[PDB]
């Protein structure tokens, strides 16, 4: 993972 998704979330916003 539920923490792995975060990296993908902050990745999209960046992007």
Swiss-Prot record:
Entire-sequence positions represented here: 280 to 294 of 517
Protein name, entry field: Acetylcholine receptor subunit delta
Localization, UniProt: Postsynaptic cell membrane; Cell membrane
Membrane-spanning parts: 1-15
Functional note: After binding acetylcholine, the AChR responds by an extensive change in conformation that affects all subunits and leads to opening of an ion-conducting channel across the plasma membrane.
Binding partners and assembly: Pentamer of two alpha chains, and one each of the beta, delta, and gamma (in immature muscle) or epsilon (in mature muscle) chains. The muscle heteropentamer composed of alpha-1, beta-1, delta, epsilon subunits interacts with the alpha-conotoxin ImII.
Domain of life assignment: Eukaryota
Protein family per UniProt: Belongs to the ligand-gated ion channel (TC 1.A.9) family. Acetylcholine receptor (TC 1.A.9.1) subfamily. Delta/CHRND sub-subfamily.
């Amino acid at each position: 993972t539920a923490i792995s998704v975060l990296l993908a979330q902050a990745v999209f916003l960046l992007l």
